């Protein structure tokens, strides 16, 4: 039973918009970043570190969040899957509920899954600064 979801049409009817769609997710993050006045370019690998993630939490509330203040620095994969399972932890609390894909599917630099979750955010921040 191939469960049909979002990637279905996105990949089966818009392999091009899927690319531009990631770039729109780069914009929402460019917002949490534009605060410290910066610029992101790889939403996919931005979770391959969960670093830019804890930064969102701070640049949103407006505070000093050093890149090495949250969990240690991701060195290998497991360490990255962690930094994302963690963002997923303060998120499951701060809301977000249960993400669809898995902390790996995100760090996996893959777009498909990572996009289903990024959508979830664009949804909650689209109206909230």
């Amino acid at each position: 039973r191939h469960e049909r979801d979002a990637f279905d049409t996105l990949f089966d009817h818009a392999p091009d918009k899927l690319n531009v769609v990631k770039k729109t997710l780069i914009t929402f993050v460019n917002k949490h970043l534009n605060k410290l006045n910066l610029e992101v370019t790889e939403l996919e690998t931005q979770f391959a570190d969960g670093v830019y993630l804890v930064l969102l939490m701070g640049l949103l509330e407006g505070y000093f969040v050093p890149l090495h203040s949250f969990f240690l620095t991701p060195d290998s994969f497991e360490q990255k899957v962690l930094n994302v399972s963690f963002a997923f932890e303060l998120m499951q609390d701060g809301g977000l509920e249960k993400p669809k894909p898995r902390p790996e599917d995100i760090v996996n630099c893959d777009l498909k899954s990572t996009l289903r979750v990024l959508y979830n955010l664009f949804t909650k921040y689209r109206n909230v600064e």
Binding site: A6, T9, L10, A14, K17, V20, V21, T24, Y119
Partner: peptide
């Protein structure tokens, strides 16, 4: 949610 993704990205 294709039609929607673009109906909002307009």
């Amino acid at each position: 949610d294709l039609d929607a993704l673009l109906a909002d990205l307009e």
